[PDB]
Design a protein around this ligand. Structure first.
Ligand code: TTP
Ligand code: MG
Ligand code: MG
Ligand code: MG
Ligand code: MG
Ligand code: MG
Lengths: 268, 1087
DNA sequence: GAATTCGAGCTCGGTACCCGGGGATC
DNA sequence: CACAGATCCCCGGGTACCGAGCTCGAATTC
């Protein structure tokens, strides 16, 4: 078909709608950096950078020809190219195709919708198809490399560690990992701790020997990661940079991640 | 000396010496700021070059011309001056009371002394002879009068003879609250019993009135406002000049005249040089019977035009503040004064009054001599008083009949007169044409809440400010003299801003000469404007036809023209015009206006014939015989007349109204309108036989006469205006709405199929273009209808549209009414009700109220909007795409790619987006305007951008605008400083708080609000081109912003720490390969 | 004990009118 | 003192919702 082509028929689409299920409106005023290896959905909430990768294998058909393209999600500044994948926006939806057609400085992407009928066919809701134009100038700053040490968590675990963290700039927090399983997310007047294995405070992870004590000055982590309603996931630390960053990737239906910048005051 | 005293300075020996201190050249640098002040005791002198003279010394020599004969009583004419006067152009008519005790020694004849015996009113005719002698003829006789109903006065104040009524009117004046009518007797008020008819209705019967001859017409203003306020006075607002013009058939307020032998043999009685009331050469004492109109002469006499321009300096602590007349240190420094000849249009003298030394630059002197213009006579003064006294002495001695200038009523004359009255206490009542007791006054709008204009009334001097003449003959955003000069004269002038005059004036005479050059060049431009437009000739045509003098024509408005024309007609027919206004003083309307049919909005590429009625409402008034005198509200007055044959009957405002027809009583408004419509038709009969530059001026002159024609209608429908009748005005509009619909239904019924069109017009046979025919009105307005002729060729469609229009006008409407095919659009974009663009057949673009023709916007948005509409209309392959846009409903374009032609239509927008951010952005392209249009206190919504900037200008002591000025302003970017300043003078600020003015925003380099200006560029595009998209401004807006290049950055204070954290950038700030290789580095870094 | 929910309320701006005011058009 | 008329679009500023979110707080309810 048309040159770059991303199709989600049913039964792999159900996974992608499930990924967008919790997120609510969060990733609607977003940026969609499509290309090889898939689509990256980037947004800024509260001053932090949140990402949602969507691999090329993770579509019923993903096909790309040309340089990567980047779309604002708000088509005509209200609607959204991801609003299709919402929780209950279109009840009877089955399928979406994203067809891109143009030349490298100017591509446009069109999104058609397909709802189930009886007797195995689909009505195209041509009242609500979307058309976007490739940005025609953009640059994003995506995370890179791999973390220093990453630990997997759960809903109750992650809920309580987010409870431990601060309120405003007065009280900076710190994810130190001590020797032989002293994972700790404290602040002055609240502190929580886990065991790191390679019951109920025994988190699993890898490269657990890599102790530190990271420090954050900006306490928007709680708001940020609560909006996305993360169900517990990876907590990845990145420190071989002048500015350490911590990434958080829910293990629920989605892989929605959020990088938070830990100020340069890195010590063990 | 003179019988009557001369109230102008013929001599002075002490005055108030104000002058800047920098004028005293050899004095230490610290006695230089400020001004001198304080009384000095020497006659005021003037230094013209090397010579020197007293200002007020006429003598033989002189530094400026003089046309005066007397000067402070001395008679400076060659002995044996006695020019014979048989014909005298008259340009102004004064009136002024004259007391027979005051003219004892004046040595008149009996027949004028008895015409002023306690008192009389004297009608002074000012003018020239064919040999250039300034005449002043005094017309004795001519006393005003009003009517009161005989029975009504007989009842409300028991009356048996007229004399008993004269007695009672005297009796009532002698008891007045403050003793203004001392000695008034029963003989100042002669009366008779006349047999007149009120003019409001057909049923009215001719009653018996008393016609009460007042003298000293201010007593008539009392005896009209305070005498028995429950009786109805009829014509007590008609001044003595109008009585003079009308009572004498043939007389005009502007035209040649002639002295006659008179009633028995009585002659013009030439006054003696001492008994002169005016500054004229020869003077006479006539009565109305010694005068004849002398038709056959047309030409204009030798009258003089002064074209002055003052320049002022501010001399306070802040010499960058703008001058203020009340401040004794903000003084006039220069007065340019050009002296043209009005007949030959030849500049005769170029005078420059200058406080202190002024050496005009040689380049300017040589440009003058190169163009043939006189050499500048620079007159130097020491003090401002001497300079202004010499200017007023020139004005009194030369006596220019016409004065002009640019903005001379809002700045120049108010500045000068405020000086001469506040500061120097000079009586201007004698500096006009009368030697004293004349009007020399200015009026400005001053929160009056109706006043249309700031006036000026000097006696015997017609001030035509070219500012007001040009605001109503050219649509410009800015009416500064430089913009007007470029737009009319094609003359890129250099302006000197008042902020740069102190720096210049402080330097030697050579920079003061530079100021004097900019002063002279301003007045030379204004003289060029005056002689391009020649306002005196058009305004005198109007004054001649109306019956008012020329100054009332320039100033008093459209109603007194109609009232005087109607008054002439009424007095002939035996009618009288009641006073109602004598007792008298939100988008609300008085009655129902005209119908505006609903447009089938959109881009119409088929022919659109535009019919419309010629002179619609005047033709209705004439066709249907509408008047006051023909109206009957009650169906009895016409109970002896056939319906439909002797009278029309129409439901107006749900009130049945009977307008009897002519052959029963001719309308008075019909005859009035005849005269004015003939005048307009005569102007239009010279448009096809004139220059292109002359057809444009003639177009504007016929448009002015059109306004006076439509004001006959308008004069009926003015509430609390003179002699209104909203039954006539509402009838006019009711018939207008009926005719618009009658025409639409006729076109829809008769010519629905091509066979019927061909049956009426066989020349349609060669006009059938290939589509399927139809002929549907797709729009209309008060008189026009836009007939979308499908299946017909645009080629001969106007030639048959003329025949259609004659067919319709013959079939439907009465004879004076006439529909006529005036255009044919080969393409039309019916945007909204009063909005459309369209290219007339094989020709010009007509833009009607779509904000390219509106003075709001900035030249940037107008330039790009014009570029877009030119694409739509002229550039084919965008008219194809645009006409293709209608094959889909608008919302389908939100999904589908727009047709492949329209891409260039967004290239313009894209370019404009580029052009709006570019950091040269000369901000004269970004200057919005708005008219003030009322005192800033008379607003209720005081949150307007031009009010914001008005107060910013008054806060900084800059030049505060005037009530109908245009207030230019930029929208500056919202910056934390601007935020703090607005709250200081008290988020996202309003556009009324980001409202700087351009002079400031350049001086202080305040940067423009790119967001606003582009959102309004797209807003103008959306307002126009919503017609392509089903009139959906929403959809249009969305589809236009899809053109614009979208851009995304990680912001600074984010990009900083990312570049610090070893993230490379990929996109703008690197070569394309470098971005690709870094993108490789990232993708393999994540993978 | 503790993952829902949805009442509870609460600030969110799009949308709708409304109004004055500029300034066009008959 | 001063004084033609009306209609009508669009913009700016104001105000009044209210559908939609979306964050705690004691109710269920694992
Ligand atoms: C322009 C204008 C029109 N009108 C009214 C009166 C008109 O009869 C009616 C139609 O307007 P117009 O077409 O503008 O004027 P017109 O048709 O009377 O004159 P013309 O022959 O040049 O076309 O609108 C005014 O009252 N005042 C005006 O200033
Ligand atoms: Mg000036
Ligand atoms: Mg001026
Ligand atoms: Mg007309
Ligand atoms: Mg016409
Ligand atoms: Mg017209």
């Amino acid at each position: 078909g048309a040159p770059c082509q991303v199709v989600l028929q049913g039964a792999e689409l159900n996974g992608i709608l499930q990924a967008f299920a919790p997120l609510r409106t969060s990733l609607l005023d977003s940026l969609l950096v499509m290309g090889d290896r898939g689509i990256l959905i980037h947004n800024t909430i509260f001053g932090e950078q949140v990402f949602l990768p969507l691999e090329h294998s993770q579509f019923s058909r993903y096909r790309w020809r040309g340089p990567t393209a980047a779309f604002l999600s708000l088509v005509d500044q209200k609607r959204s190219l991801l609003s299709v994948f919402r929780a209950n926006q279109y009840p009877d939806l089955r399928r979406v195709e994203l067809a891109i057609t143009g030349q490298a400085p100017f591509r446009t992407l069109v999104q058609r919708i397909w709802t189930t009928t009886s007797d195995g066919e689909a009505v195209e809701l041509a009242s609500e198809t979307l058309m976007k134009r490739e940005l025609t100038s953009f640059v994003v700053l995506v995370p890179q490399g791999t973390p220093d040490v990453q630990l997997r968590l759960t809903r109750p675990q992650l809920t309580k560690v987010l409870n431990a963290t601060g309120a405003d700039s007065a009280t900076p927090t710190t994810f130190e990992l001590g020797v032989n399983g002293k994972f700790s997310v404290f602040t002055t007047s609240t502190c929580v701790t886990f065991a790191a294995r390679e019951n109920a405070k025994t988190v699993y992870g890898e490269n657990t020997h890599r102790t530190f004590s990271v420090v954050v000055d900006d306490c928007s982590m709680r708001a940020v990661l609560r909006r996305l309603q993360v169900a517990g996931g990876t907590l990845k630390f990145f420190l071989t940079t002048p500015v350490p960053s911590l990434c958080v990737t829910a293990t629920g239906p989605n892989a929605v991640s959020a990088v938070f910048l830990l100020k340069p005051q890195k010590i063990c | 000396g003179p019988t009557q005293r001369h109230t102008y300075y013929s001599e002075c020996d002490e005055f108030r010496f104000i002058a800047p201190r920098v004028l005293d050249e050899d004095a230490p640098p610290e006695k230089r700021a400020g001004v001198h002040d304080g009384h000095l005791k020497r006659a005021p002198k003037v230094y013209c070059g090397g010579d020197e003279r007293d200002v007020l010394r006429v003598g033989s020599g002189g530094f400026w011309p003089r046309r005066s004969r007397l000067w402070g009583g001395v008679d400076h004419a060659p002995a044996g001056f006695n020019p014979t006067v048989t014909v005298f152009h008259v340009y102004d008519i004064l009136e002024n009371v004259e007391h027979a005790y005051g003219m004892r020694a004046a040595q008149f004849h009996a027949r004028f002394m008895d015409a002023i015996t306690p008192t009389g009113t004297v009608i002074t005719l000012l003018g020239l002879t064919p040999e250039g002698h300034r005449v002043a003829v005094h017309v004795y006789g001519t006393r005003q009068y009003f009517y009161m109903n005989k029975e009504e006065v007989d009842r409300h104040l028991q009356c048996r003879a007229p004399r008993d009524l004269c007695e009672r009117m005297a009796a009532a004046l002698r008891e007045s609250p403050g003793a203004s009518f001392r000695g008034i007797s029963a003989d100042h008020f002669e009366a008779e019993v006349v047999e007149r008819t009120d003019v409001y209705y057909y049923e009215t019967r001719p009653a018996l009135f008393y016609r009460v001859y007042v003298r000293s017409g201010r007593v008539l203003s009392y005896l009209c406002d305070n005498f028995c306020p429950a009786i109805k006075k009829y014509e007590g607002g008609v001044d003595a000049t109008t009585r003079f013009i009308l009572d004498n058939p043939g007389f005009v307020t502007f035209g040649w005249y002639r002295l006659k032998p008179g009633r028995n043999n009585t002659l013009a009685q030439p006054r003696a040089p001492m008994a002169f009331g005016t500054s004229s050469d020869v003077e006479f004492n006539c009565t109305a019977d010694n005068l004849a109109i002398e038709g056959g002469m047309s030409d204009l006499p030798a009258y003089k035009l002064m074209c002055f321009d003052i320049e002022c300096k501010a001399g306070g602590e802040d010499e960058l503040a703008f001058p203020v007349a009340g401040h004794p240190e903000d003084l006039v420094i220069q007065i340019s004064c050009l002296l043209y000849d009005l007949s030959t249009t030849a500049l005769e003298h170029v005078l420059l009054f200058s406080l202190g030394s002024c050496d005009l630059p040689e380049s300017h002197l040589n440009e003058l001599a190169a163009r043939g213009l006189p050499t500048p006579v620079v007159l130097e003064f020491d003090s401002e008083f001497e300079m202004l006294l010499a200017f007023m002495t020139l004005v009194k001695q030369y006596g220019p009949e016409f004065v002009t200038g640019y903005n001379i009523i809002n700045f120049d004359w108010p500045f000068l007169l405020a000086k001469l009255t506040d500061i120097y206490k000079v009586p201007l009542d004698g500096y006009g044409r009368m030697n004293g007791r004349g009007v020399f006054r200015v009026w400005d709008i001053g929160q009056s809440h109706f006043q249309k204009r700031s006036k000026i009334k000097v006696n015997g001097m017609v001030n035509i400010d070219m500012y007001g003449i040009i605001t109503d003959k050219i649509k410009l955003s800015s009416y500064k003299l430089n913009a007007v000069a470029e737009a009319v004269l094609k003359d890129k002038k250099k302006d000197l801003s008042y902020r740069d005059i102190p720096a210049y004036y402080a330097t030697g005479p050579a920079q003061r000469g530079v100021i004097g050059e900019y002063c002279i060049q301003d007045s030379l431009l204004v003289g060029q404007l005056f002689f391009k437009f020649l306002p005196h000739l058009e305004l005198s045509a109007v004054a001649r036809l109306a019956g008012i003098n020329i100054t009332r024509t320039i100033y008093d408005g459209q109603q007194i023209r109609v009232f005087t024309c109607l008054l002439r007609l009424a007095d002939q027919k035996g009618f009288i015009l009641p006073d109602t206004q004598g007792r008298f003083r939100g988008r609300h309307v008085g009655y129902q206006g005209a119908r505006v049919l609903d447009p089938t909005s959109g881009f119409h590429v088929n022919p659109v014939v535009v019919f419309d009625f010629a002179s619609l409402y005047p033709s209705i008034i004439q066709a249907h015989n509408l008047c006051f005198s023909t109206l009957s509200l009650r169906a009895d007055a016409v109970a002896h007349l056939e319906a439909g044959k002797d009278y029309l009957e129409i439901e107006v405002g749900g009130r049945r109204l009977f307008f009897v027809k002519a052959h029963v009583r001719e309308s008075l408004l019909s005859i009035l309108l005849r005269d004015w419509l003939a005048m307009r038709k005569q102007i239009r009969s010279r448009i096809p036989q004139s220059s292109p530059e002359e057809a444009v001026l003639l177009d504007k002159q016929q448009a002015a006469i059109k306004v006076v024609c439509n004001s006959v209608y308008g004069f009926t429908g003015v509430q609390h205006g003179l002699l209104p009748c909203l039954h006539v005005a509402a009838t006019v509009t009711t018939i207008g709405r009926e005719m618009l619909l009658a025409t639409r239904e006729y076109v829809h019924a008769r010519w629905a199929a091509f066979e019927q069109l061909l049956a009426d017009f066989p020349e349609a046979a060669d006009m059938r273009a290939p589509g399927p025919y139809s002929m549907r009105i797709i729009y209309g307005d008060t008189d026009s209808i836009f007939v979308l002729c499908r299946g017909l060729t645009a080629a001969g469609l106007t030639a048959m549209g003329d025949k259609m229009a004659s067919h319709i006008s013959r079939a439907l409407f009465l004879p004076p009414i006439k529909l006529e095919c005036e255009k044919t659009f080969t393409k039309l974009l019916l945007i909204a009700k009063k909005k459309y663009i369209g290219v007339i057949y094989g020709g010009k673009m007509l833009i009607k109220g779509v904000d390219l023709v509106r003075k709001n916007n900035c030249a940037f948005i107008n330039r790009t909007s014009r570029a877009l509409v030119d694409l739509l209309f002229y550039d084919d392959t965008v008219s194809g795409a645009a006409a293709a846009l209608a094959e889909r409903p608008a919302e389908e374009w939100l999904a589908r790619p727009l047709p492949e032609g329209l891409q260039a239509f967004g290239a313009v927008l894209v370019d404009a987006h580029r052009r709006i951010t570019d950091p040269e952005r000369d901000i004269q392209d970004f200057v919005l305007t708005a008219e003030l249009s009322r005192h800033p206190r008379a607003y209720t919504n005081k949150r307007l951008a031009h009010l914001t900037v008005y107060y910013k200008l008054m806060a900084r002591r800059a030049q505060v605008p005037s009530i109908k000025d245009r207030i230019p302003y930029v929208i500056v970017a919202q910056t934390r400083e601007v935020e703090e300043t607005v709250a200081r003078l008290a988020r996202k600020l309003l556009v009324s708080e980001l409202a700087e003015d351009p002079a400031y925003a350049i001086a202080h380099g305040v940067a423009l609000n790119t967001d606003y200006y582009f959102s309004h560029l797209l807003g103008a595009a959306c307002v126009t081109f919503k017609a392509l998209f089903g009139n959906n401004a929403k959809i249009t807006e969305s589809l236009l912003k899809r053109f614009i290049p979208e851009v995304w950055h990680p912001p600074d204070d984010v990009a900083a720490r990312l570049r610090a954290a070893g993230f490379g950038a990929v996109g703008a700030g690197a070569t394309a390969e470098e971005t690709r290789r870094m993108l490789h580095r990232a993708f393999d870094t994540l993978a």
